[PDB]
């Protein structure tokens, strides 16, 4: 967005009550490292978090 | 830091031509928007300059073999050779932006807002 | 050329709710959306309120919306304040990405 935080002090972030999708996420900027663990990427839109 | 300037004034008499420009600043018209509306105070507008590039059919039935335009995208500054400039379009245009529906401002739904503009150039087509 | 019927003068009381409109055919009653309603003070370029018709603008206050049936409209401009007498007008699709829009309803704030 502009600017985040350092990892010793790890930046936070409260997400709720709202529609999340992964195929929105190759469009403002490609990724180079995607590894959801445990979790394919293709059903997480069909799980509701 | 990021506006969009007109730019390339000028007289223009009848047979005559001049290139007109619309600079933006900040932001590179490789990847933005450009929207020419062209406002007459007091009564209706009218938006009319089709160029979205790469060059295919998209034109509107009004303004066929008048208004040729062209590109540069890294210059971030597009520039407007309307030939065949007629008498009774005195108006002062204005190049903006929209909205799509591609990025985080828009993932369920449609788009179009234009928000930013020029501040117009005052150029008369007199005889 | 090219140019859609609005009712050019309106007005409405301080506090009270306004109506406005821009017309279409039945060649746009099926299924489409588009339509994103302006505001102008005379003179100047405009200012965007209104868009994505019942949904909601980034920074814009909330007493402004709009509403959507049929041949029967509303841009429901409600909380009228003393700024409100600028000029409006909407967006419209005319197919195939095609755009076309209404002719310039004017407010007036009494009172």
């Known amino acids: 967005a502009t600017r985040f935080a350092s990892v010793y002090a790890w930046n936070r972030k409260r997400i709720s009550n709202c529609v999340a999708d992964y195929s929105v996420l190759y469009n403002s900027a490609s990724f180079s490292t995607f590894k959801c663990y445990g979790v394919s990427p293709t059903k997480l839109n069909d799980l509701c978090f | 830091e990021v506006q969009l300037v007109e730019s390339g004034g000028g007289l223009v008499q009848p047979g005559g031509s001049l290139r007109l420009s619309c600079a933006a600043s900040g932001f590179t018209v490789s990847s933005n928007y450009m929207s020419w509306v062209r406002q007459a105070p007091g009564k209706g507008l009218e938006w009319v300059s089709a160029?979205?590039?790469?060059?295919?059919?998209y034109y509107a039935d009004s303004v066929k073999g008048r208004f040729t335009i062209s590109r540069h995208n890294p210059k971030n500054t597009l520039y407007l050779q309307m030939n065949s400039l007629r008498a009774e379009d005195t108006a002062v245009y204005y190049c903006?932006?929209?909205?799509?529906?591609?990025?985080?401002?828009?993932?369920?739904?449609?788009?179009?807002?234009?928000?930013?503009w020029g501040q117009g150039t005052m150029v008369t087509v007199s005889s | 050329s090219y140019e859609l019927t609005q009712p050019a003068s309106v007005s409405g009381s301080p506090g009270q709710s306004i109506t406005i409109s821009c017309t279409g055919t039945?060649?746009?009653?099926?299924?489409?959306?588009?339509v994103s309603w302006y505001q102008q003070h005379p003179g100047k370029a405009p200012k965007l309120m209104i868009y994505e018709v019942s949904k909601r603008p980034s920074g814009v206050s909330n007493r402004f919306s709009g509403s959507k049936s049929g041949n029967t409209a509303s841009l429901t401009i409600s909380g009228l304040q003393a700024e409100d007498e600028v000029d409006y007008y909407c967006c419209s699709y005319a197919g195939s990405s095609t755009w076309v829009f209404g002719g310039g309803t004017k407010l007036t704030v009494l009172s």
């Open positions: 039945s060649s746009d009653v099926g299924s489409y959306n588009l």
């Open positions: 160029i979205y590039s790469g060059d295919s059919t």
């Open positions: 903006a932006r929209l909205v799509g529906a591609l990025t985080n401002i828009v993932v369920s739904g449609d788009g179009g807002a234009f928000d930013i």
